[PDB]
Amino acid sequence: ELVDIPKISYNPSELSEPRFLEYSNLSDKLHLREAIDKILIPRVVGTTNHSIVREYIVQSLRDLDWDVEVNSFHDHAPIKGKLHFHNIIATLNPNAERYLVLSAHYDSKYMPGVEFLGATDSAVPAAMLLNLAQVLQEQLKPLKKSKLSLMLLFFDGEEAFEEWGPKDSIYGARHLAKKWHHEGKLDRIDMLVLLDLLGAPDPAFYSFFENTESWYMRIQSVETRLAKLQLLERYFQSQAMRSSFIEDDHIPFLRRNVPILHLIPVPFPSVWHTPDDNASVIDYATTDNLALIIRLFALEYLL
Ligand SMILES: COc1ccc(NC(=S)NCCCn2ccnc2)cc1OC
Ligand SMILES: [Cl-]
Ligand SMILES: [Zn+2]
Numbered sequence: 001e002l003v004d005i006p007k008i009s010y011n012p013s014e015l016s017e018p019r020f021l022e023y024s025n026l027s028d029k030l031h032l033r034e035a036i037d038k039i040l041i042p043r044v045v046g047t048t049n050h051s052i053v054r055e056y057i058v059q060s061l062r063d064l065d066w067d068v069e070v071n072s073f074h075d076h077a078p079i080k081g082k083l084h085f086h087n088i089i090a091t092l093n094p095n096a097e098r099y100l101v102l103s104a105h106y107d108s109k110y111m112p113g114v115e116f117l118g119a120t121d122s123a124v125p126a127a128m129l130l131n132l133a134q135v136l137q138e139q140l141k142p143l144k145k146s147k148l149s150l151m152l153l154f155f156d157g158e159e160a161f162e163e164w165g166p167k168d169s170i171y172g173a174r175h176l177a178k179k180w181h182h183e184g185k186l187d188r189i190d191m192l193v194l195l196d197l198l199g200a201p202d203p204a205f206y207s208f209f210e211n212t213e214s215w216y217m218r219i220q221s222v223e224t225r226l227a228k229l230q231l232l233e234r235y236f237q238s239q240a241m242r243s244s245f246i247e248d249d250h251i252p253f254l255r256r257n258v259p260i261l262h263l264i265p266v267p268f269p270s271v272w273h274t275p276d277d278n279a280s281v282i283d284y285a286t287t288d289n290l291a292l293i294i295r296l297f298a299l300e301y302l303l
Contacts, residue, residue: 035127078162096149105158124199177252203265
């Protein structure tokens, strides 16, 4: 299962001390909390709430001068039948040649009679991405015009409607990876960074994929550097995990040799797919720290 990551993959934080200090002190706690609050509502595909959450994501980023495409399509799910799914694709430069993609799923799992909020899964991850664009507004402006740019991708229909299987999960990612495959729009992904199950306490991360192990070690180094500077209020292990075959929105991209960085803890939060994955499970020290590490990774990668 676990192997120590070899030195060849170490990839220390590169930002200059003044820039690392400057950027690591950018935050917006209130906005992060407000974004969480707006998304932390039952949001099953096809519900009014599902549309409201899409609108909030869409308008938040449009107001930050991002280009936002909504990829709408129909597909049949068990129980529900014909559903209208809506992936959200936000770019700072819509005419960039290449992208770092940060992603999370915005739907919540259909759990009859239970108003499942999916706080970690993935209300908090989506919020971290809105918060990232909000916090780093100034520093990301250059990426509106550059060849390498940033994409925030919000997947729809990640969750199963009946029982998690290859045909009853990741509805939006399966459609989009297929669509981009056909349109020749997958090679442009430097890597797809997928945030999932974040916001609960004591997350442990591991590198899942050897072609991105090096950029995992850049996040690990960001975390180390922040610890040393007293900027955190450890998560990333210097170990990789093989034959874990965790299924999520990345799979249809992974299958087609898009490099994945899967930011999902192992073990999953204890409250996973229970009603306790709600407002009360969110650890806001952990959430602030993770959001920061991810914001700095993004800046490390993109400059
Ligand atoms: C009990 O913890 C686990 C449960 C299942 C699996 N195996 C798979 S294939 N999970 C697919 C995850 C889909 N998903 C992610 C977020 N919302 C839904 C691994 C677990 O711990 C490693
Ligand atoms: Cl509703
Ligand atoms: Zn889930």
